Design an enzyme around this catalytic site. Structure first.
Site, PDB file in Angstrom:
ATOM      1  N   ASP A  10       0.761  -0.947  -0.085  1.00 20.97           N
ATOM      2  CA  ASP A  10       0.035  -0.030   0.076  1.00 20.97           C
ATOM      3  C   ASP A  10       1.041   1.312   0.074  1.00 20.97           C
ATOM      4  O   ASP A  10       1.918   1.184   0.887  1.00 20.97           O
ATOM      5  CB  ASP A  10      -0.929   0.102   1.275  1.00 20.97           C
ATOM      6  CG  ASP A  10      -2.002  -0.988   1.186  1.00 20.97           C
ATOM      7  OD1 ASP A  10      -1.765  -2.350   0.737  1.00 20.97           O
ATOM      8  OD2 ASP A  10      -3.003  -0.516   2.011  1.00 20.97           O
ATOM      9  N   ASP A 129     -15.967  -3.345   1.409  1.00 22.55           N
ATOM     10  CA  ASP A 129     -15.218  -2.971   2.539  1.00 22.55           C
ATOM     11  C   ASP A 129     -16.218  -2.835   3.499  1.00 22.55           C
ATOM     12  O   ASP A 129     -17.247  -1.941   3.273  1.00 22.55           O
ATOM     13  CB  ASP A 129     -14.504  -1.560   2.451  1.00 22.55           C
ATOM     14  CG  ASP A 129     -13.162  -1.821   1.771  1.00 22.55           C
ATOM     15  OD1 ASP A 129     -13.065  -2.727   0.804  1.00 22.55           O
ATOM     16  OD2 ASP A 129     -12.445  -1.072   1.869  1.00 22.55           O
TER      17      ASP A 129
END
Length: 234
Positions: A10, A129
């Site tokens: 990330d 999510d």
């Protein structure tokens, strides 16, 4: 029929970072994204899960760097982060990544997502999510899965926000429930803390769990990627 592992990189402000609950401002830094990606490849990774957090949070982007990381990988790359319109999608696909993930921002435009799935097929997965069964914002998880199934969505990446970046273990119940709801492959994300956690996820492969994205456990050295690949091997 082995569980695929997708070690994560990330990127925020050009650095490899980990978050907690996917929250901007919780970054812990781990240095160069291309050093991290190359380390995963060296260790035997089949996949890289690459995320542009600046694009995800709308604070500029790391387009050059994620292209450079992607093009450096001989392995398959799943690219995510702020892919929400034709231009951001085109930039992601231009990296030569194997597939992209369309997540929360994309889902604010469900008709666009339907069009993207129709055009690009298996190059598209959708990131769901959740806290509990509520999508981030964002809607019921199961209503979304039903709609996306009908739209021809190839694959779902399911993140339990409550467990992401916590090292408390994955939500196995959530994975089982999503697998009961859809016939599409499911990629697990969030909470892995140990080799035993990966073995537990691997037990769900027959239900429809295809892979596990692993972030903090690798960076925080709970285990090595070699150990993880061995643990899920047959």
């Amino acid at each position: 029929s082995r569980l695929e592992l997708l070690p994560a990189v990330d990127v925020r402000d050009g650095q490899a970072v980990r978050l907690v609950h996917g929250e901007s401002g919780t970054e812990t830094s781990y240095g160069s994204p291309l050093e991290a990606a190359l380390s995963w490849q060296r260790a035997g990774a089949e996949w890289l899960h690459l995320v542009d957090l600046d694009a995800a949070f709308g604070t500029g982007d790391n387009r050059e760097l994620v292209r450079q990381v992607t093009e450096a990988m001989d392995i398959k790359v799943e690219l995510s982060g702020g892919i929400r319109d034709d231009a951001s999608l085109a930039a992601a696909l231009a990296t030569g990544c194997t597939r992209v993930n369309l997540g929360t921002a994309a889902l604010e435009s469900p008709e666009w997502v339907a069009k993207v799935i129709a055009e690009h097929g298996d190059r598209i997965a959708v990131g769901l999510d959740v806290r509990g069964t509520t999508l981030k914002g964002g809607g019921d998880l199961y209503e979304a899965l039903e709609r996306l199934d009908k739209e021809g969505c190839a694959r779902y990446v399911v993140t339990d926000i409550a467990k992401d970046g916590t090292l408390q273990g994955p939500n196995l119940e959530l994975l089982r429930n999503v697998c009961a709801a859809t016939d599409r492959p499911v990629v697990a994300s969030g909470g892995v803390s140990s080799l035993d956690d990966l073995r537990a996820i691997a037990e769900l492969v027959p239900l429809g769990v295809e892979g596990s994205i692993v972030g903090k456990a690798l960076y925080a050295k709970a285990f090595t990627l070699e150990e993880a690949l061995e643990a899920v091997a047959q």
